[PDB]
């Protein structure tokens, strides 16, 4: 159990712009905390001469991040009256009241005060902190229970009194509880002191975003694949579970032997050994030559089962898959959500903002593109005609089957195009600070490694769910 008390100074010394800026920090915090699957009870207070309580931890809705965010958004600087005064002592007493009891010992408390440190009214605020610690029985039995309280102070503005701010903040070894708001490094650090990573390792679509993170931290699901032959092939893939990596079928051949295939994840020097490669039963690169289709990429998906079971860390995590319980929670949706609903949410009828990862000279970069899934779709699909060996395809809708997603082009924006090596990589949708794989990079219209018809086609994972559900039925992924 965890309660987070947002206390924001709204007196004269703060000002409209910075008061707004302060809310932003709080809005981002609420958002980042929620993305970790954590649901604390929130307290929202503003203050000047007196405090104004906008949210109390006891309200049922206090634990609904969307609601609390809404409230915080509706707060207007001018809403708080009597700005001539600043009584931080009182503001803290309003927090006290929320903790006051007219399983208490198992609830953690985090106070986040945003002020410039200049209280010109009331007594010394430290008093209330003392009262609070007393109330929570902290620092009594040398069982201290120091872990149950955290007082963070975010100094707002240019004219801050560092002494007072330092005075109220918690004082814990190896930790920082004071941060100037303009300092983003400090604010970033606070977050990781507040939330326990360990509790979110089993979460799909998670990313450690800290500034010190590497390429593997930023793309934890990313898996590089090598095939030694003839020419050596290179492909990307995604970790979907501790035993499986999802990729493109055309990256292999029934002639490639298990041992000639190696997988690399998490920025590790070593390579991994696979047990077997599972191609989608319907994949047949030669099944449409007669219809004028040399290479046929319908159902171009494959699941590589590793010999050894992976362990999730900050450099190795699974990505979320369509229509699973992981995606529902990642999307913060009720347990009654359907596959169809997830689809309407992840893939709406329009230009969908998505991304894919590409290796650019040792470094992994994110390539933002748009999925033409609206009235601009059909147009994107037709461009397939300009593809090598497709100039005589009877009906083009025969190559661009109902399994493909279409990206690339000049509108709505100049999308970048996949390069040789990206095949098999995940086509992702970023929502609620989480990452959802909606496709598998399959093939492109043009080799741009540009023309308005340089398009890229991906396998819509929604169109192969029966297969995924079947092959991953034991990976504890909870498909719907
Ligand atoms: P993929 O790596 O990349 C295309 C989709 C551009 O293609 C095979 C030849 C590896
Ligand atoms: Mg003031
Ligand atoms: Na709401
Ligand atoms: Na003690
Ligand atoms: Na950990
Ligand atoms: Na480490
Ligand atoms: Na669920
Ligand atoms: Na669909």
């Amino acid at each position: 159990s965890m309660n987070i008390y947002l206390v924001l100074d709204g007196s004269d010394s703060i000002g409209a712009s910075n008061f707004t800026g302060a809310k932003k920090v709080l809005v981002n915090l609420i958002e980042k905390v929620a993305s970790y699957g954590v649901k604390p009870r929130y307290g929202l207070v503003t203050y000047a001469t007196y405090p104004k309580i906008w949210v109390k931890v006891s309200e049922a809705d206090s634990s609904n991040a969307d609601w609390v965010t809404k409230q915080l958004n509706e707060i207007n600087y001018e809403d708080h009256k009597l700005k001539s005064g600043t009584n931080t002592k009182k503001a803290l007493q309003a927090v006290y009241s929320m903790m006051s009891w007219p399983g208490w010992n198992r609830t953690r408390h985090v106070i986040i005060l945003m002020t410039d440190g200049l209280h010109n009214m009331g007594g010394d605020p430290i008093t209330v902190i003392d009262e609070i610690r007393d109330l929570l029985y902290i620092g009594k039995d040398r069982n201290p229970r120091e872990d149950y309280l955290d007082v963070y102070v975010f100094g707002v503005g240019p004219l801050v009194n560092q002494v007072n701010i330092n005075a109220l903040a918690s004082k814990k070894d190896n930790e920082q509880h004071v941060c100037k708001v303009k300092d983003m490094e400090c604010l970033e650090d606070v977050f990781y002191q507040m939330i326990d990573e360990s509790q979110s390792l089993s979460l799909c679509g998670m990313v450690w975003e800290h500034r010190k993170g590497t390429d593997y931290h930023k793309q934890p699901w990313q898996a590089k694949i090598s095939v030694i032959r003839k020419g050596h092939e290179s492909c990307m893939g995604a970790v979907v579970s501790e035993y499986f990596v999802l990729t493109a079928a055309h990256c292999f051949t029934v002639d490639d032997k298990e041992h000639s295939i190696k997988v690399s994840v998490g920025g590790e020097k070593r390579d991994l050994e696979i047990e077997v490669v599972l191609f989608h039963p319907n994949y047949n690169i030669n099944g449409k030559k007669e219809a004028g289709i040399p290479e046929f990429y319908d159902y171009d998906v494959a699941l590589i089962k590793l010999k050894n079971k992976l362990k999730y860390g900050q450099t190795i995590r699974p990505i979320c898959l369509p229509c699973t319980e992981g995606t529902t929670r990642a999307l913060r949706l009720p347990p009654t959500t359907t596959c169809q609903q997830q689809k309407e949410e992840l893939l709406p009828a329009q230009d969908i903002k998505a991304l894919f990862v590409s290796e650019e000279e040792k470094k992994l970069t994110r390539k933002e593109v748009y999925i033409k899934n609206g009235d601009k779709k059909g147009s994107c699909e037709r461009d397939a005609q300009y593809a090598p060996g497709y100039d005589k395809v009877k009906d083009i809708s025969e190559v661009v089957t109902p399994r493909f997603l279409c990206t690339g082009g000049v509108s709505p924006y100049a999308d970048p195009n996949t390069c040789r090596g990206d095949s098999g990589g995940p086509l992702i949708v970023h929502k609620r600070s989480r990452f959802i794989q909606v496709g598998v990079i399959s093939w492109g219209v043009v080799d741009v490694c540009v023309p308005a018809h340089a398009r890229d086609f991906h396998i819509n994972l929604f169109q192969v769910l029966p297969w995924l559900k079947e092959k991953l039925q034991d990976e504890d992924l909870g498909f719907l």
Side-chain angles (χ1 to χ4, degrees), residues 214-229 231-234:
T214 69
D215 289 355
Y216 319 109
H217 286 296
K218 299 170 191 303
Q219 289 83 210
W221 57 73
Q222 211 58 25
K224 205 164 179 301
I225 308 174
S226 291
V227 189
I228 172 176
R229 310 194 158 154
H232 294 167
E233 188 134 45
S234 183

Side-chain angles (χ1 to χ4, degrees), residues 360 364-393 395-419 421:
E360 280 185 355
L364 300 183
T365 175
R366 283 179 183 166
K367 298 304 187 63
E368 177 174 299
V369 298
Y370 291 67
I371 300 175
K372 321 306 190 291
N373 199 45
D375 58 59
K376 178 141 47 175
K377 176 187 175 189
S379 320
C380 186
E381 306 195 319
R382 288 188 274 285
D383 289 286
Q385 53 178 66
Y386 306 84
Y390 274 29
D391 51 294
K392 74 184 196 68
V393 181
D395 179 357
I396 205 62
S397 82
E398 216 184 355
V399 294
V400 180
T401 69
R403 263 73 53 179
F404 293 99
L405 293 178
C406 200
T407 68
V410 298
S411 82
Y413 306 74
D415 285 17
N417 295 79
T418 61
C419 292

Side-chain angles (χ1 to χ4, degrees), residues 60-77 79-100 102-103 105 107 109-127:
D61 298 347
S62 71
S63 66
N64 178 152
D66 279 342
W67 186 70
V68 176
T69 293
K70 177 179 168 176
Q71 307 311 101
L72 182 55
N73 278 168
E74 291 174 359
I75 293 176
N76 187 85
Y77 184 60
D79 282 353
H80 206 98
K81 316 303 179 177
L82 313 170
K83 301 191 175 297
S84 303
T86 300
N87 196 141
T88 308
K89 183 189 173 61
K90 283 190 167 301
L92 286 176
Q93 285 179 303
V95 174
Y96 183 81
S97 303
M98 283 185 229
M99 308 168 96
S100 223
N105 63 297
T107 295
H109 297 86
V110 184
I111 295 175
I112 299 176
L113 178 69
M114 298 190 81
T115 175
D116 62 10
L118 306 173
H119 61 278
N120 52 66
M121 274 176 215
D124 188 344
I126 312 292
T127 273

Side-chain angles (χ1 to χ4, degrees), residues 324-326 328-329 333-337 480:
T324 57
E325 295 186 307
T328 292
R329 292 192 286 282
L333 290 175
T336 54
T337 300
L480 308 183

Side-chain angles (χ1 to χ4, degrees), residues 14 30 59 79 105 111 122 251 253 313 326 349 378 384 396 412 424 432:
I14 306 305
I30 298 168
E59 287 177 286
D79 282 353
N105 63 297
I111 295 175
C251 287
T253 170
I396 205 62
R432 299 293 209 171

